[PDB]
Design an enzyme around this catalytic site. Structure first.
Site, short mmCIF file in Angstrom:
data_model
loop_
_atom_site.label_atom_id
_atom_site.label_comp_id
_atom_site.label_asym_id
_atom_site.label_seq_id
_atom_site.Cartn_x
_atom_site.Cartn_y
_atom_site.Cartn_z
N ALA A 229 0.99 -1.09 -0.16
CA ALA A 229 0.03 0.15 -0.18
C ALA A 229 1.04 1.40 -0.13
O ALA A 229 1.02 2.01 -1.08
CB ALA A 229 -0.99 0.09 1.31
N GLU A 259 11.75 6.44 -0.44
CA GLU A 259 11.95 5.68 -1.72
C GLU A 259 12.80 6.26 -2.61
O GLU A 259 12.46 7.31 -3.22
CB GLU A 259 10.61 5.47 -2.30
CG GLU A 259 9.73 4.51 -1.56
CD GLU A 259 8.25 4.00 -2.18
OE1 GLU A 259 8.18 4.69 -3.15
OE2 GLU A 259 7.41 3.72 -1.61
N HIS A 277 8.65 -0.63 -5.34
CA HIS A 277 7.16 -0.04 -5.72
C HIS A 277 6.97 -0.69 -7.07
O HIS A 277 6.41 0.20 -7.89
CB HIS A 277 7.23 1.44 -5.42
CG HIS A 277 6.21 2.07 -5.11
ND1 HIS A 277 5.88 3.13 -4.35
CD2 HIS A 277 4.83 1.97 -5.87
CE1 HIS A 277 4.68 3.35 -4.56
NE2 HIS A 277 3.87 2.81 -5.46
N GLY A 279 3.84 -2.20 -7.70
CA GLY A 279 2.55 -2.45 -7.71
C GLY A 279 1.84 -2.11 -9.07
O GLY A 279 0.96 -2.84 -9.37
N1 LIG Z 1 1.95 -0.38 -4.24
C1 LIG Z 1 1.60 0.24 -5.61
O1 LIG Z 1 2.11 0.32 -6.58
C2 LIG Z 1 0.02 0.52 -5.13
C3 LIG Z 1 -0.94 0.65 -6.51
C4 LIG Z 1 -2.03 0.98 -6.35
C5 LIG Z 1 -2.54 1.52 -5.25
N2 LIG Z 1 -1.55 1.43 -4.11
C6 LIG Z 1 -2.08 1.78 -2.88
O2 LIG Z 1 -3.02 0.95 -1.95
C7 LIG Z 1 -3.82 1.64 -1.02
C8 LIG Z 1 -5.31 1.11 -1.50
O3 LIG Z 1 -5.58 1.41 -2.85
P1 LIG Z 1 -7.12 1.16 -3.17
O4 LIG Z 1 -7.27 1.59 -4.54
O5 LIG Z 1 -7.83 -0.15 -2.75
O6 LIG Z 1 -8.04 2.36 -2.05
P2 LIG Z 1 -9.41 2.42 -1.79
O7 LIG Z 1 -9.61 3.69 -1.58
O8 LIG Z 1 -10.43 2.03 -3.10
O9 LIG Z 1 -9.72 1.69 -0.68
C9 LIG Z 1 -9.02 2.27 0.48
C10 LIG Z 1 -9.89 1.64 1.75
O10 LIG Z 1 -9.17 1.91 2.95
C11 LIG Z 1 -10.13 2.22 3.82
N3 LIG Z 1 -9.54 2.81 5.24
C12 LIG Z 1 -9.27 4.08 5.54
N4 LIG Z 1 -8.59 3.85 6.80
C13 LIG Z 1 -8.66 2.67 7.46
C14 LIG Z 1 -8.35 1.94 8.64
N5 LIG Z 1 -7.96 2.80 9.25
N6 LIG Z 1 -8.62 0.68 8.53
C15 LIG Z 1 -8.98 -0.22 7.59
N7 LIG Z 1 -9.31 0.62 6.27
C16 LIG Z 1 -9.25 1.91 6.33
C17 LIG Z 1 -11.05 3.19 3.51
O11 LIG Z 1 -12.10 3.22 4.29
C18 LIG Z 1 -11.29 2.60 1.91
O12 LIG Z 1 -12.51 1.73 1.76
C19 LIG Z 1 -3.65 3.19 -1.21
O13 LIG Z 1 -2.70 3.42 -0.19
C20 LIG Z 1 -3.16 3.02 -2.68
O14 LIG Z 1 -2.45 4.59 -2.88
C21 LIG Z 1 -0.38 1.05 -3.94
#
Ligand SMILES: NC(=O)c1ccc[n+]([C@@H]2O[C@H](COP(=O)([O-])OP(=O)(O)OC[C@H]3O[C@@H](n4cnc5c(N)ncnc54)[C@H](O)[C@@H]3O)[C@@H](O)[C@H]2O)c1
Ligand SMILES: NC(=O)c1ccc[n+]([C@@H]2O[C@H](COP(=O)([O-])OP(=O)(O)OC[C@H]3O[C@@H](n4cnc5c(N)ncnc54)[C@H](O)[C@@H]3O)[C@@H](O)[C@H]2O)c1
Lengths: 301, 302
Positions: A229, A259, A277, A279
């Protein structure tokens, strides 16, 4: 107007922009001074993660009007500086979800069987059967924190391996999570149940150190954790202490508080698997994000 | 049917089950040829995993020996010909390893799609090389599965959850049966051109030695990725190296080799090859199940 793409994007980004009648300049690996120079004839800037759109760049970029990031969040844009000037910031919250979910699943399997370490061993000429005794995913419990776009895709994939998938999300109703086979519980009940934990939340004050010394203390001894994440959601110091005591048996990290990270203790640990990174680093995700951001630039008439 | 020597490192449940069945058990590991033959002097049963080599010489010197059990699939470390000629029964554990081997195979597919092992190696070398590790998203890609028995079908249902199209071939499983676990059967010649990934889950037989070879690689898509967690030699190793060298094959994942450990290092050393020291069955759970599975046959024998 005229848009500069300062990082490496799928070529469809460029195509969609020109189709909308815009001048594009595509120029990777610019110095801070080179970037400012280019931008002074530009009202749009499009980045991935390499270009750092700092307040100094923004302030020097007097004609700039919109900054687009071809990825989630705004990690490399000073959103506060952009807002202080008249500058719109846009991003691509949908295009890379599936690729991120798939890497997370791969990382779980790698933790279970130590594939990266076993490959490294083989490449040193070793044949280490005993060292690399692993664990079967069937019957194990995966805790998923964050049940939005990525968390729910991780759940359905891992359910096919026979994993029990439990989790927590403040916004997602129990009824919505039940529809993709995730039982929600309070965090305090999740910790002692999990064999594996994966985080899929935004990075916020409330999610920084979501896993930390206090929560590791409540986990099952030998828990395996995945962070694909944002760096910092798993507290890196706590994680190292957990790895050191055996409280955590292994971790897989795509993301870091810095990073590239300057602190190498986690990366260098025998039980830690890592990626730079990656993802959203698939041809497909990159094609989808390049389109997503370009269309937003065209849609402003 | 009285004394059993267990000669390799097995789950402790094997011993207990034999003992509950009413058998005497001796666990001794790492034995030389002469030592193995001496321990077997009072033994009518021998249980091995992979390290103990039940050669023709051992079989022929072991006088009271009536049954050999292997706690794994196939008979790789047992001279079955020699055993059959002397009238010794050989038993193995065809069920206990299936799920762990299917899981490793799936892990290997993911590792090939996203270069996780190479990425980890790069990070451990202090590098941050994103562009190099640009990967492939599995959703919508085609996985060819050759061998649709215990493991093939488990691999299929798992990779289906990623949105992969799963096609394959098995001479004894009907297209209607494979349809029931989501695998579309087609003739081999129709498979090669369709696959983004190919995985093999057959025994090692004349019909399967070099099942992938220089000719089938030339029929595949440029950039195909190949997994062998079955037996070494099903994918011809020379052909695979040549395919990796030309780029016809973008990468391969190998748990198994024609020689173990392999003396030829060219494939393991290739940057696009990921590998393991035959770990397909190497989980606590699988080893428990296999240990049970083989002791239970021995007890029914009583
Ligand atoms: N590693 C990578 O290359 C890569 C690629 C895409 C997304 N990401 C990251 O992955 C994460 C998730 O992305 P997504 O698209 O599923 O986001 P999304 O917004 O669809 O879902 C995120 C969820 O996290 C929840 N949340 C907030 N606080 C919380 C808590 N304290 N406990 C549990 N849940 C909580 C929100 O309520 C939401 O439903 C983000 O940080 C995003 O930036 C990383
Ligand atoms: N890497 C490991 O640690 C590990 C662990 C367990 C099993 N294995 C191996 O994996 C393989 C699969 O085991 P299984 O339990 O699924 O066996 P299985 O007997 O259940 O299935 C094997 C299938 O291969 C098929 N087959 C035979 N010839 C074929 C051909 N020419 N083309 C396509 N299919 C063909 C058979 O018809 C059969 O259905 C075996 O080689 C086994 O020894 C490896």
């Amino acid at each position: 107007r005229k848009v500069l793409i300062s990082d490496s994007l799928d070529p469809c980004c460029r195509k969609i922009l020109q189709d909308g009648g815009l001048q594009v300049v595509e120029k990777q690996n610019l110095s801070k001074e080179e970037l400012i120079a280019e931008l002074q004839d530009c009202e749009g800037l499009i980045v991935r993660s390499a270009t750092k759109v700092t307040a100094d760049v923004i302030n020097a970029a007097e004609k700039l009007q919109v900054v687009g990031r071809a990825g989630t969040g705004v990690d490399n844009v000073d959103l506060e500086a952009a807002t202080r000037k008249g500058i719109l910031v846009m991003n691509t919250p949908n295009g890379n979800s599936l690729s991120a979910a798939e890497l997370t699943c791969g990382m779980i399997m790698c933790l279970a069987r130590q594939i990266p370490q076993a490959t490294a061993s083989m490449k040193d000429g070793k044949w280490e059967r005993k060292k690399f005794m692993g664990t079967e995913l069937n019957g194990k419990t995966l805790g998923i924190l964050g049940l939005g776009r990525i968390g729910r895709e991780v759940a359905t994939r891992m359910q096919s391996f026979g994993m029990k998938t439990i989790g927590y999300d403040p916004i997602i109703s129990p009824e919505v999570s039940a529809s993709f086979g995730v039982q929600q519980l309070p965090l305090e009940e999740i910790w002692p149940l999990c064999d594996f934990i994966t985080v899929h939340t935004p990075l916020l004050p409330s999610t920084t150190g979501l896993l930390n010394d206090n929560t590791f203390a409540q986990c099952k001894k030998g828990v395996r954790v995945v962070n694909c994440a944002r760096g910092g959601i798993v507290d890196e110091g706590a994680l190292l202490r957990a790895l050191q005591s055996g409280q955590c048996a292994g971790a897989a990290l795509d993301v870091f508080t810095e990073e590239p990270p300057r602190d190498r203790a986690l990366v260098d640990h025998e039980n830690v698997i890592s990626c730079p990174h990656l993802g959203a680093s698939t041809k497909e995700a990159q094609s989808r994000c390049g389109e997503e951001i370009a269309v937003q630039f065209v849609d402003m008439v």
